[PDB]
């Protein structure tokens, strides 16, 4: 970090969120003035405040604020900006944005425009990669227009078929086929969806690869044409065409194949005169036949996972390249620094569709920065709100260690010690992935989440010892709350006679089974007997901090108490999963048998989408009651949110309406019978 180099005194960072904060911080390491653009709603974000001055660029929607180029060059004129960074996606693929920046003093920090054009169309991308002497996914080169052509191409390539339209951030518009009838009907639906999404209709049909590993290679390229490959980033774990866990040093990959990968990627970059940091994605099979799948000219979303092992600041060198300086670091300078694992904590509900979009505000937000070997990148703070106008990303968590086991353990401890309240997160999913046996040993594939949980994610299944530990912790916490309730100050008129109950006899209702617990106290040590098993729980018993660390039978367990009621109900986050327990005294539980049960029935919802527009919120779940006037969700269509009356009884099988999705008329918000 030499401050003598004068790359750009003033920079404009054309993005928002965690990456905006990362870029601003990197420029601060250079002592570079930062100009961060922000929407009017996002005028209170972290990056707008931390940057040296800022200019509002429009309303809440990104189409009218970040995509309305008028406000952008007005802000540039106001700030006299000199450099621009597209960030994750955003306007990286916008060639009009590139040319209008070129018309001004701002310089697009990135590769050549024609390189972005070449990666935009997948047919030309494959043709160039074959020209660039890079192994390709097998298939047909060209564009299909008719169903007969599609089925014939399936004949040459085989039944596994990747009907894939051109472009698409994060591999958008990929589909699976297995039959000639499947080939033709999928080709028809793929033409339909390509027209709906992009309209290119450049369906690049190629042979599908089963049990693959999506392995990324990062190539840093100066403006002089030199290309330098920096290790790799395995992204085998994904769902809904989105990556959740990233492993930078790939366990499957070895050194010789890695260096061959980097050599091919460097040759590909030099074949295009690459002058930025790019990513090349491969489909490694059992035989390590890494085939070229797309090439992202933008900086990768999960770049920090390798930044730890490479030991180099990718953004710093990218800015130096934007200055035009050659690559100071060589391949020998690129040395792996241990193991690194990254997980992206999102604002989605993992229990529904492996992550379902959600909206809300963050009341409590605390990161596990006190843990060793844990780093957090985020662009949100306590009180920041999740907006439908932008993607729902909370943060990214990275751990580095000597080996894989150390990194996995540090991820586990960091995810346990991470406090988020107000919105629903997918911490349970990430922790279950990082502690799953298959992911531990290494045998993972792109379909990891589809076969490990065929019926969908259902939470951690705690074992018998874990069940006893959870029951002991819950009973101890309940007794501790009671004991603190018995502590007042000195009245001097009516003295308090502290009751002398020795052993608490509780009844705990975990799931359906009912467990009898006998809990006794001694100083700060709780002796808890659950159905005969005797355990010791010791902790400071601080009943106000969100994170509580107990020591059950020597083993240290970190738990969170989300909610509690005078009726006895408790919500405990324990090993990532949130369990609801119901603790009662033996007398109260005995008397509760006389209480009449209050039952509410709600099943079999049904309705399609009879108006278009962006859904404000979702109001039903598969298996909910409807009648003449029951609304599935709230749909806004040109400044009116009509209540969409069901009027009939059917059966939901899955739901396609998610808050923040522009779902049109007749698009079947919920699919039904």
């Amino acid at each position: 970090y030499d401050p003598n180099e004068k790359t750009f005194d003033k920079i404009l960072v054309a993005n928002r969120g965690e990456i905006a904060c990362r870029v601003i911080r990197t420029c601060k390491k250079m002592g570079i003035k930062t100009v961060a653009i922000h929407s009017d709603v996002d005028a209170s974000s972290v990056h707008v405040k931390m940057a040296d001055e800022a200019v509002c660029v429009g309303p809440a929607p990104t189409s009218k604020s970040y995509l309305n180029m008028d406000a952008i060059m007005e802000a540039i004129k106001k700030t006299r900006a000199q450099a621009v960074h597209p960030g994750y996606g955003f306007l990286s693929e916008n060639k009009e944005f590139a040319r209008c920046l070129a018309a001004e003093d701002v310089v697009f920090i990135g590769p050549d425009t024609h390189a972005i054009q070449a990666m935009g169309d997948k047919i030309e991308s494959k043709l160039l990669a074959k020209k660039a002497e890079v192994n390709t996914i097998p298939g047909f080169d060209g564009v299909v227009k008719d169903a007969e052509e599609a089925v014939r191409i399936a004949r040459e390539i085989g039944y596994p078929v990747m009907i894939k339209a051109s472009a698409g951030g994060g591999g958008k518009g990929m589909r699976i086929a297995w039959d000639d009838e499947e080939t033709r009907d999928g080709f028809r639906l793929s033409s339909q969806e390509a027209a709906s999404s992009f309209g290119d209709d450049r369906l690049l049909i190629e042979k599908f690869i089963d049990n693959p590993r999506h392995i990324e290679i990062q190539v840093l390229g100066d403006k002089h044409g030199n290309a330098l490959w920096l290790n790799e980033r395995e992204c085998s774990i994904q769902r809904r065409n989105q990556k959740v866990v990233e492993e930078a040093p790939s366990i499957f990959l070895d050194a010789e194949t890695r260096r061959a990968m980097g050599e091919q990627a460097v040759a590909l970059a030099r074949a295009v005169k690459y002058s930025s940091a790019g990513t090349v994605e491969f489909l490694v099979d059992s035989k390590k036949n890494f085939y070229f799948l797309e090439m992202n000219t933008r900086l990768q979303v999960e770049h920090p996972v390798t930044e730890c092992i490479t030991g180099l600041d990718l953004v710093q060198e990218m800015i130096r390249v934007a200055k035009g300086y050659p690559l100071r670091h060589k391949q020998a300078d690129i040395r792996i620094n241990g193991w690194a694992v990254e997980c992206r904590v999102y604002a989605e509900d993992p229990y529904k569709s492996f992550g379902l979009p959600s909206i809300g505000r963050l009341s409590q937000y605390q990161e596990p920065l006190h843990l060793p070997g844990v780093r957090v990148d985020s662009g949100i703070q306590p009180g920041s709100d999740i907006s439908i106008y932008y993607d729902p990303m909370i943060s990214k968590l990275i751990t580095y260690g000597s080996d894989r086991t150390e990194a996995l353990k540090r991820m586990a401890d960091a995810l346990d010690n991470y406090v988020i309240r107000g919105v629903t997160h997918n911490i349970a999913l990430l922790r279950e992935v990082i502690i799953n046996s298959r992911f531990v040993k290494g045998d993972i594939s792109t379909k990891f989440l589809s076969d490990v949980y065929p019926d969908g994610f259902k939470g951690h299944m705690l074992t018998k010892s874990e069940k006893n530990q959870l029951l002991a912790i819950a009973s101890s916490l309940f007794v501790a709350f009671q004991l603190r309730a018995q502590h007042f100050q000195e009245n001097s008129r009516m003295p308090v006679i502290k009751p002398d109950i020795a052993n608490w006899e509780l009844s705990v209702k975990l799931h359906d089974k009912v467990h009898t617990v006998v809990a006794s106290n001694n100083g700060s040590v709780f002796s808890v007997e659950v159905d005969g098993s005797k355990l010791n729980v010791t902790s400071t018993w601080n009943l106000a901090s969100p994170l509580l660390s107990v020591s059950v039978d020597g083993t240290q367990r970190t738990v969170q108490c989300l909610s509690r009621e005078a009726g006895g109900n408790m919500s405990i986050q324990f090993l990532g999963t949130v369990y609801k327990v119901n603790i009662l005294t033996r007398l109260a539980a005995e008397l509760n048998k006389f209480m009449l049960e209050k039952v509410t029935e709600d099943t079999s919802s049904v309705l399609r989408s009879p108006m278009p527009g962006v859904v404000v919120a979702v109001s039903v779940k598969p298996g909910d009651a409807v009648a003449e006037g029951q609304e599935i969700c709230v749909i806004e269509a040109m400044k009116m949110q009509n209540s969409m009356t069901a009027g009939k009884t059917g059966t939901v099988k899955s739901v396609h309406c998610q808050a923040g999705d522009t779902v049109g008329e007749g698009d079947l918000l919920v699919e039904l019978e």
């Binding site: 009341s363 409590q364 306590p382 009180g383 920041s384 106000a544």
Partner: protein, 247 residues
């Protein structure tokens, strides 16, 4: 639960524009001990929030306006509901904390025929009679009579604070312009000048009606400190058998 805990989640809970609402109960949960709050009448007259909480271990009675239901406007039911709660907290030496986000009294014919004057007077009397420590925080708009109905400093209030989003005014700023500059009929710049000079706590602040303009994230800490120093408060009033509340 530390007494000087910061509450940054309250930094941007008050929306910038005056036509948006928020949940005052989120503010209450952020401020009070362990985010625990026992609500009273949580389903009746939902435009006022009353309940019990703890601050540094001491029982406190929380009263506040809910800008969600009926825009937070005061009416008959909310007046009685808040008045009796304040009177009870008075009778048993329980300190009171108020969150003021009231735009004014609810207008209508049913409200007038129901005797909105009597019940508004009930709430005003309940706050003006209080001899327990009272801490008032003004999150947003406080216009009209309601500004001093909700325990203003002028009712022998102890410490009054204002968030940087407070708007203390005689009445509606547009109405104030239309009633002052009626003979001007050039409100194009008059409205801008009047909102610049009077849609801020600065008139009240320079008049000393509010003790400070606290940052939203210090609220809890500040209140805790106050609840200590005022725990010894004693005030003397003229002798009487009892007063005549507008019951």
């Amino acid at each position: 639960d530390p007494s000087d805990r910061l509450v940054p989640e309250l930094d941007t809970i008050v929306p910038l524009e005056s036509t948006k609402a928020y949940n005052m109960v989120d503010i209450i949960h952020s401020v009070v001990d362990e985010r625990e709050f026992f609500e009273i009448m949580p389903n009746y007259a939902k435009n006022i929030i009353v309940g019990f909480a703890r601050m540094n271990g001491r029982t406190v009675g929380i009263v506040g306006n809910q800008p969600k239901v009926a825009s937070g406007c005061l009416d008959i039911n909310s007046s009685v509901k808040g008045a009796r709660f304040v009177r009870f907290c008075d009778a048993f030496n329980i300190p009171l904390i108020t969150f003021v986000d009231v735009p004014g009294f609810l207008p209508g014919t049913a409200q007038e025929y129901g005797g909105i004057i009597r019940h508004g007077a009930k709430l005003l009397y309940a706050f003006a009679e209080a001899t327990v420590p009272k801490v008032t925080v003004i999150t947003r708009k406080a216009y009209g009579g309601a500004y001093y109905v909700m325990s203003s400093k002028h009712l022998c209030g102890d410490t009054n604070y204002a968030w940087p989003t407070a708007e203390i005014a005689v009445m509606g700023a547009k109405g104030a312009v239309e009633i002052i500059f009626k003979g001007h009929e050039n409100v194009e710049a008059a409205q801008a000048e009047y909102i610049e000079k009077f849609a801020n706590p600065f008139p009240a602040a320079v008049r000393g009606f509010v003790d400070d303009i606290i940052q939203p994230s210090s609220t809890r800490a500040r209140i805790c400190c106050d609840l200590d120093v005022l725990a010894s408060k004693k005030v003397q009033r003229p002798w009487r058998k009892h007063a005549n509340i507008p019951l």
